[PDB]
């Protein structure tokens, strides 16, 4: 699950480097058919696994419920867009008698993405590379802090 695996590597590096940050502060200042509830809680798991920024489920619970409901609404808004374009009942859509689809099956998808949020496709490629670069960037920032603290404690 390479996306899951890399978010997990972010998670592990966050755990260890934040632990080291905290102990370093301490030493410085020393001186299948599925149902609704399982779906909800799986989404909550995935959400709190997103949150490399703060801390994984390190906030009040109301906010977790908030976030869950919001992302539910967003996903629903996606699909309500695509299915609306697909029914269409308009001459611009609708298979022509001579099999002439003014806009083929793919422009539908690209377009529904466009209406909601995302502008272009390659912004996803961008956010992906951005994620993996965030990994090494925060990695190396806190690793340089680690090395400098290893120097400082001496």
């Amino acid at each position: 699950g390479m996306n899951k695996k890399f978010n997990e590597i972010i998670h592990l590096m966050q755990q260890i480097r934040r632990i080291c940050f905290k102990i370093s502060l301490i030493r410085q200042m020393q001186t299948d058919k599925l149902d609704s509830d399982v779906s909800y809680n799986s989404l909550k798991r995935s959400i709190s696994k997103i949150l490399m920024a703060n801390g994984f489920e390190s906030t009040a619970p109301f906010c977790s419920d908030v976030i869950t409901q919001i992302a539910e609404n967003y996903f629903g808004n996606l699909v309500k867009t695509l299915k609306n374009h697909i029914e269409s009942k308009s001459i611009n859509k609708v298979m022509g008698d001579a099999k002439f689809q003014k806009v083929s099956n793919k422009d539908i998808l690209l377009l529904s993405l466009l209406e909601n949020g995302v502008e272009s496709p390659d912004a996803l490629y961008e956010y992906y590379n951005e994620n993996i670069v965030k990994q090494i960037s925060k990695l190396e920032g806190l690793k340089s802090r680690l090395s400098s603290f290893l120097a400082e404690l001496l």
Binding site: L34, S42, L43
Partner: peptide, 14 residues
């Protein structure tokens, strides 16, 4: 190589 964090089952439900 690219499988979103959101599991396939949950998205199928939604």
């Amino acid at each position: 190589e690219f499988t979103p964090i959101i599991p396939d089952a949950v998205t199928d439900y939604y």
